[PDB]
DNA sequence: TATACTGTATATATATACAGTA
DNA sequence: TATACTGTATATATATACAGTA
């Protein structure tokens, strides 16, 4: 259930002295920003927002209006064969922003310092040049490699001696950009 | 002006009050958590903590109490105070207290490259085989430690960079802490 | 019944002064 | 005078019910 034109007002005033003063307004100081002549309009606009579900009032308490990461999406592979969980990282921290993360499952990145178990920061687009690592679905299939197309034959090339390119028709099988590599997280 | 011991306490306490419930506690509610009989203890305490400037009091206004991610701190050598980032903490075991941006490939085998950003927990307990931030006469750096009583050797994670062997009775060493991650955040082509 | 308010009332939550003790 | 509290008191800040209007 979305929020009324008037009720949209009430969530952003909320917000925005929360943002100036440290702590949210009472049903008063709502009143008196929004030109309310009664206090109890600033009360039953919160009753309202409680029940739409954006704001929780704590009872009793005075000024007691509680306003309500990255994605781990699953598994891309790294040489080895093909949502679970959030992580609390900044998405403005890489170039371009990441949108989600995948666990590396492989050593084929190795010489490039992505190593299996990393969770991997990817950038949701389709427009990918050559050159760049990409994240790439064959068939069901998400794999990590660095990309290099030349129209129907498509190579996706790994950084380590031992793993050989992915060769890539699309005459016959299926292609798809999940998102660009923007950057790797290592935990454990 | 420093915080006493109790004064650090009411101030971590609102810190993570404001954290949890979105809103400052009342004098009754840090007296209840703290174990106060008396929410005067409180009031008189946040009245401190106004005088030495880390908080400000709000005159009249009900919770009126207004407070006044992991840092980068320079490089890490792998051979070879500046930014802040909203990394979580508690992401690491354990967890991760600063930033440290790597400087080398010695340790290249296990991942840790040439501009990443090594996740560091501040300790001094380490043990022989762990990835260790360690100084050697104002250098820092980035090794797999091999203690062996005075003779401390560093290992590096490549073929061809070789271990760093300190000696403790003539060399200065200081244990920074324990590399426990790593981020890397570079727009490459 | 719902939004969107005015206007009044009131119990209680809350800040905060004052008087003490160690 | 300061820290670090107990214990009491109270003006007022505040939530929140209740009666209306459009």
Redesign the pocket.
């Given at each position: 259930k979305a929020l009324?034109?008037?009720?949209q007002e009430v969530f952003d005033l909320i917000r925005d002295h929360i943002s100036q003063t440290g702590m949210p307004p009472?049903?008063?100081?709502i009143?008196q920003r929004?030109?309310?002549?009664?206090?109890?309009?600033?009360?039953?606009?919160l009753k309202?927002l409680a029940?739409k579900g954006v704001i929780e009032?704590v009872?009793?308490?005075?000024?007691?209006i509680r306003l309500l990461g990255l994605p781990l999406v699953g598994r891309v592979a790294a040489g080895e064969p093909l949502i679970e969980g959030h992580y609390q990282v900044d998405p403005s921290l890489f170039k371009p922003n990441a949108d989600f993360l995948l666990r590396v499952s492989g050593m084929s990145m190795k010489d490039i310092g992505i190593m299996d178990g990393d969770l991997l920061a990817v950038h949701k687009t389709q427009d990918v040049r050559n050159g760049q690592v990409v994240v790439a679905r064959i068939d069901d299939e998400v794999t990590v490699a660095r990309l290099k197309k030349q129209g129907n034959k498509v190579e996706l090339l790994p950084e380590n001696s031992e793993f050989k390119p992915i060769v890539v028709d699309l005459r016959q099988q299926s292609f798809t950009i999940e998102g660009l590599a923007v950057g790797v997280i290592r935990n454990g």
């Open positions: 009324t034109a008037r009720q009472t049903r008063a100081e009143a929004l030109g309310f002549r009664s206090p109890n309009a600033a009360e039953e606009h309202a029940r009032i009872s009793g308490a005075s000024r007691g």
